[PDB]
Amino acid sequence: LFLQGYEKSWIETEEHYFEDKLIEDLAKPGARVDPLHQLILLFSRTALTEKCKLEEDFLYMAYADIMAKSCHSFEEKEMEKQKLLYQQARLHDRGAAEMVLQTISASKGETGPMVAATLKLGIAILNGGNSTVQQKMLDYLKEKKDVGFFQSLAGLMQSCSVLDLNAFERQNKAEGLGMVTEEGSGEKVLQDDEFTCDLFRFLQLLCEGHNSDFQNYLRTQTGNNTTVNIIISTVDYLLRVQESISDFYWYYSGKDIIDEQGQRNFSKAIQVAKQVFNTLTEYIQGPCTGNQQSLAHSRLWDAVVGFLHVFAHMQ
């Protein structure tokens, strides 16, 4: 029991920092192709090899996190803003911008620890308005007319997470009956909320700034043959989470007590809905009449009236 407790709460408590030095010495061509470039090419070929299911690939799951954590009063804010661009260019010119896209497309809408890491890598590579990486990704997607990326994004968004009241009250009854240990992934009521937030932050950064080209490509993939609308999928997920929030509030009616779980599971959904709203705001930020009309002729009004109804009472 002592060694169990030791390995549980003594060793993995953030006792190292190497994710930057490692990549810095891995990108040096001391003498061709750099070692980091060879690694990126290996990951790209593994993601491009035709299969039927994305494997575990512990190597990829371990190296994508290192490559993501490698990245990140006027001069003190400008020097870091320029060093972030330098760290992003340290690996986005070696093929990571296309490697992330290929890894996402090679999962065809299966929520797993592979997409859960490639999305964090995309976040780290697109932190801020990196129009260069945005244009590289757009040019890649337009020169290789693949649908397996957009349909994979749709399949991922269709099964992200929803607060279910039945599992919440069931876990509450379990806690009341016995001191059962708490579940790690948000008490089995919100599955991969962090993954959902990362996916929608990635979709937001893909259109951050005023990139009208990508804003229109996310609505109509002109050039392909089975274009899918990402804006409508985002609206559908927003409506789902709005109905979920409404039901979770209707559960907390009459009882003027909000417990710790009732606070945490509520704040998680609040953050998820905030991220979805920010993603829609970035979709329609530039005066893109396409996305304007797409949001007008959709089910966003039901979501916003449900949000108004829940706000007028929660306040």
Binding site: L26, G30, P35, Q38, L42, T46, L59, Y63
Partner: peptide, 20 residues
Amino acid sequence: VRWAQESVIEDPELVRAMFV
């Protein structure tokens, strides 16, 4: 790192073992 800096490596199993 010296092997990879010396030459590009085919046989992806080799580079996989090296990087792990």
